Amino acid sequence: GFRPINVSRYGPGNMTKSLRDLSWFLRYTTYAIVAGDPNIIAVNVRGL
């Protein structure tokens, strides 16, 4: 039941919050790798 969403139906002000999250999902993954503990991934994702 998944379809890829179009940008024109979505909105440019709506997707500029969206695309920075995709860097932010791995920016905290790079933070947690050098932190040596996955707690910061596993606490900022619950209920997102």
Partner 1 sequence: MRDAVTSLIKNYDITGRYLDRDAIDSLKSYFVTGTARVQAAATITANAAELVKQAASQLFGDLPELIRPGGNAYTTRRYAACLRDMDYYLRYATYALVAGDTDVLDERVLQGLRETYNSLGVPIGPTVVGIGILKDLATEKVQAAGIEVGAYLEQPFDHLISELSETDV
Partner 2 sequence: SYLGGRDQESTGFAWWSGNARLINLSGKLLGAHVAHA
Partner 3 sequence: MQDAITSVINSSDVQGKYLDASAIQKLKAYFATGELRVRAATTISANAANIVKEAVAKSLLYSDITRPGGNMYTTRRYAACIRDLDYYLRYATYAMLAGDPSILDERVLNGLKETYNSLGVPIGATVQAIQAMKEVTAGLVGADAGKEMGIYFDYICSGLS
Ligand X SMILES: *[C@H](C)[C@H]1/C(=C/c2[nH]c(/C=C3N=C(/C=C4\NC(=O)C(CC)=C4C)C(C)=C\3CCC(=O)O)c(CCC(=O)O)c2C)NC(=O)[C@@H]1C
Binding site for partner 1 (CB under 8 A): 17, 43-48
If binding is defined by CB under 6 A, does position 28 make contact with ligand X? yes
Q: Whole-angstrom Cα distance, residue 29 to residue 45?
A: 11
Can you read off the two tokens belonging to residue 35? Answer: 């932190």
Size of the site for partner 2 (CB under 8 A): 6
39 binds, among partner 3, ligand X, partner 2, none (CB under 5 to 8 A by kind): none
The one-letter code for the residue type at 6 is N
CB 28 within 8 A of CB 41: yes
Residues in the site for ligand X, rule: CB under 6 A? 14, 17-18, 21-22, 24-25, 28, 44-45, 48
